């Protein structure tokens, strides 16, 4: 029985996709751990596929099983619009995800796009796509057709301006297939192809900038630097005395800033570091992974105060602090163990940002591949049987377009499963919501 095999094919999508896509909206909101720019697009994808599992797929089912459109004529226009609207916001949202990642990976940053521009791009996407899919809403027609003398039956189909003029309906079905399926899958493919080699054959680059008056922080910096070199980093030591602040951090995966503490009844930085601190906003620090060390003397009121001062400025500038600062007491040669320890801890933290990157990059690639393969049938169809215009095999054809349409609807419910399976901070977040309910 074909009607029942499509009964549960369409609703398990509805159910797998409402619960699935409701968890993604929820956890990105309830957990500040999860509020990132990438997850806001991921929740935007989720909100696009929720609009399809609850609005479209429910009324689609009943128009397929019964065969008669039993809802209003307003919905006959709106459900095809709400369906086209979703695939465009999805395609725009995935294309933004791929480019943003590519940009963070060349600038060696943890954010390029701000959390407040990301809301503005999410707006344009719904705005630009609500305009691009309005032909889907206007060129629908509500009227009667009787297959045989069944006394009530009404269908819902597309009607393009001419009585036999097919051209408006194909260029739309060719430009949109072009500008919104092979163009954005072209861009996405290009980005992840570059990103992938990048992530595979990169060497980490470290900048060490210290300020040192009698050589203690300088000795500490040489000691850090010998462990990061032994760890496969390409290390770059610069005395603060010899640099200028503009663009100083650009290109580096890791910046360590070392400074000794000075001053009289107040904290002062080491003297060569003052100009770098006064100009720290021109260095490229937002999104940059940093850490801080310094030499001090626990006799003083604020032991290694300069570290705190720098850590707070870097934090104000929106930099991503990666360890708590290292504060050496006395002669750093007598503290070599504490220093080499610290350096090993910084290295491990960088390995986790790098690993978190690879893991999330490969989940994002699975999402697009499961998107493009699932839309491949329907669009193959759409391209073929919109240059042909001869398909009266509708005992097969209508089934061909539905079973093709069911595949594409799997791109809705699939996304929460990939997150839970292939991303451990999602896995834990879903199970941390099903544990407070
Ligand atoms: C499934 C039930 N059935 C019959 C089996 C439907 O027809 C169901 C429907 C349900 C209830 C009432 C009326 C219609 N219809 C199912 C198809 N759909 C629809 C319409 C448009 C899009 N955008 C694209 O594909 C698309 C995506 C990216 C790039 C280009 C295109 C593109 C668009 C237009 C022409 N070229 C290419 C997707 C859609 F899914 C609207 C409702
Ligand atoms: C005048 C003066 C003020 C100092 N103030 C502090 C301080 O406030 N907090 C602190 O932890 N160490 C303080 N120190 C100790 C120095 O930070 C320490 O001697 C350090 O080793 C100098 O580092 P450097 O040789 O790399 O420049 C002060 C030292 C001097 C001479």
182 and 87, same domain (yes or no):
yes
44 and 134, same domain (yes or no):
yes
| Residue 357 is assigned to a structural domain of this protein | no
Q: How far is CA 291 from CA 278, 321, 322, 400, in A?
A: 18, 6, 6, 59
d(CA 189, CA 181): 12
143 and 57, same domain (yes or no):
yes
40 and 112, same domain (yes or no):
yes
Identify the CA nearest to 76 among candidates 7, 139, 25.
Answer: 139
238 contacts 190 by C-beta, under 8 angstroms: no
| Residue 378 is assigned to a structural domain of this protein | no
154 contacts 71 by C-beta, under 8 angstroms: no
Q: How far is the CA of 382 from the centre of ligand 1 (A)?
A: 9
Residue 27 sits in a domain whose CATH number is: 1.20.1070.10
34 contacts 428 by C-beta, under 8 angstroms: no
Instruction: Tell me the technique behind this structure.
Output: X-ray
Q: How far is the CA of 304 from the centre of ligand 2 (A)?
A: 8
157 contacts 94 by C-beta, under 8 angstroms: no
d(CA 433, CA 416): 14
130 contacts 137 by C-beta, under 8 angstroms: no
Residues in the chain preceding a C-to-N separation beyond 2.5 angstroms (breaks): none
Residue whose pair of structure tokens reads 């209003």 in the numeric block: 72
169 and 23, same domain (yes or no):
yes
Please identify, by atom number, the ligand 2 atom nearest to the C-alpha of residue 305.
Answer: 9
Strand (E) or helix (H) holding 259: strand 254-259
DSSP 50-63: HHIIIIIHHHHHHH
Range of the domain at 16: 2-200+389-433
**243: CB partners within 8 A, 6+ apart:** 209, 276
Domain count, the chain: 2
Please identify, by atom number, the ligand 1 atom nearest to the C-alpha of residue 383.
Answer: 36
Residue 222 sits in a domain whose CATH number is: 3.40.50.360
Identify the CA nearest to 293 among candidates 250, 262, 338, 334.
Answer: 338
188 and 292, same domain (yes or no):
no
In 10 A of CB 387, how many CB atoms?
11
d(CA 390, CA 223): 76
For the chain, count helices (H), then strands (E).
14, 10
52 and 194, same domain (yes or no):
yes
| Residue 76 is assigned to a structural domain of this protein | yes
d(CA 158, CA 341): 69
66 and 86, same domain (yes or no):
yes
Measured from CB, residues less than 6 Å from any atom of ligand 2 are 212-218, 260-263, 267, 270, 295-297, 300, 302-305
Longest dimension (CA), the chain: 101
Nearest-ligand number for the alpha carbon of 172? 1
Rounded to the nearest 10 degrees, the angle between the axes of helix 2-30 and helix 37-51 is 150
Q: How far is the CA of 417 from the centre of ligand 1 (A)?
A: 24
77 contacts 85 by C-beta, under 8 angstroms: no
Q: Tell me which of 331, 352, 373 is where a domain ends.
A: 352
319 contacts 286 by C-beta, under 8 angstroms: yes
Measured from CB, residues less than 6 Å from any atom of ligand 1 are 59-60, 63-64, 79-80, 83-84, 87, 91, 136, 156, 172-173, 176-177, 180-181, 382, 401-402, 405
| Residue 377 is assigned to a structural domain of this protein | no
In 10 A of CB 204, how many CB atoms?
18
Q: How far is the CA of 171 from the centre of ligand 2 (A)?
A: 73
Q: Tell me which of 299, 326, 352 is where a domain ends.
A: 352
Q: How far is the CA of 358 from the centre of ligand 1 (A)?
A: 35
**132: CB partners within 8 A, 6+ apart:** 84, 88, 176, 180
Q: 370 is written with which tokens?
A: 């499961």
87 and 102, same domain (yes or no):
yes
Q: 25 is written with which tokens?
A: 């909206």
| Residue 274 is assigned to a structural domain of this protein | yes
| Residue 372 is assigned to a structural domain of this protein | no
| Residue 363 is assigned to a structural domain of this protein | no
Nearest CA to ligand 2 atom 29: 262
Q: Tell me which of 336, 352, 368 is where a domain ends.
A: 352
195 and 222, same domain (yes or no):
no
| Residue 28 is assigned to a structural domain of this protein | yes
- Choose which residue among 405, 407, 409, 411 to substitute to test ligand 1 binding: the one with the highest number of ligand atoms within 8 A of its C-beta: 405
Resolution in A: 2.8
Nearest-ligand number for the alpha carbon of 80? 1
For residues 221, 222, 228, 233, the Cα torsion angle rounded to the nearest 10 degrees is: 100
- Name the 3-class secondary structure at 144: strand
Nearest-ligand number for the alpha carbon of 387? 1
- Name the 3-class secondary structure at 159: coil
219 and 306, same domain (yes or no):
yes
168 and 258, same domain (yes or no):
no
């Amino acid at each position: 029985e074909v009607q029942v095999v499509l009964i549960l094919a369409y609703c398990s999508i509805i159910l797998l996709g409402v619960i699935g896509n409701s968890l993604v909206i929820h956890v990105v909101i309830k957990f500040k751990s999860m509020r990132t720019v990438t997850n806001f697009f991921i929740a935007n994808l989720a909100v696009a596929d929720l609009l399809v599992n609850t609005l479209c797929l429910p009324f689609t089912l009943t128009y397929t099983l019964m065969g008669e459109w039993k809802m209003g004529p307003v919905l006959c226009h709106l459900v095809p619009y709400a369906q086209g609207l979703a695939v465009q916001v999805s395609t725009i949202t995935l294309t933004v995800i791929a480019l943003d990642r590519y940009r963070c990976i060349v600038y060696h940053l943890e954010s390029k796009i701000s959390k407040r521009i990301s809301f503005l791009i999410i707006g344009l996407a719904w705005g630009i796509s609500a305009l691009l899919a309005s032909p889907l809403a206007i060129f629908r027609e509500y009227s009667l057709i009787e297959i045989i003398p069944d006394f009530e039956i009404v269908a819902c189909t597309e009607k393009w301006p001419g009585e036999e003029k097919s051209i408006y309906g194909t260029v739309y079905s060719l430009s949109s297939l072009l500008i919104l399926y092979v163009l954005p899958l072209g861009i996405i493919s290009f980005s992840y192809t570059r990103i992938w080699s990048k992530l595979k054959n990169h060497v980490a680059k470290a900048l060490i900038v210290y300020g040192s008056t009698t050589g203690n922080t300088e000795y500490t910096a040489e000691t850090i630097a010998r462990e990061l070199a032994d760890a496969g980093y390409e290390v770059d030591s610069r005395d603060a005395a010899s640099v200028e602040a503009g663009g100083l951090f650009e290109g580096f995966d890791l910046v360590l800033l070392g400074c000794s503490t000075w001053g009289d009844d107040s904290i002062e930085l080491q003297d060569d570091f003052i100009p770098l601190f006064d100009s720290l906003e021109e260095t490229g620090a937002q999104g940059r992974k940093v850490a801080c060390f310094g030499c001090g003397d626990s006799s003083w009121e604020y032991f290694c105060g300069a570290v705190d001062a720098i850590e707070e400025k870097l934090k104000n500038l929106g930099a991503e602090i990666v360890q708590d600062g290292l504060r050496i007491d006395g002669d750093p040669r007598a503290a070599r163990d504490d220093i080499v320890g610290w350096a090993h801890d910084v290295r491990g933290a960088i390995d986790h940002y790098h690993q978190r990157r690879q893991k999330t990059t490969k989940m994002l690639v699975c999402v697009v591949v499961v998107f493009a393969v699932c839309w491949l049938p329907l669009h193959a169809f759409q391209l073929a049987v919109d240059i042909d215009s001869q398909v009266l095999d509708l005992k097969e054809y209508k089934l061909i377009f539905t079973v093709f349409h069911i595949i594409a609807m799997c791109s809705t419910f699939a996304n929460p499963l990939l997150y839970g399976w292939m991303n451990s901070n999602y896995r834990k977040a879903f199970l941390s919501a099903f544990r407070c309910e």
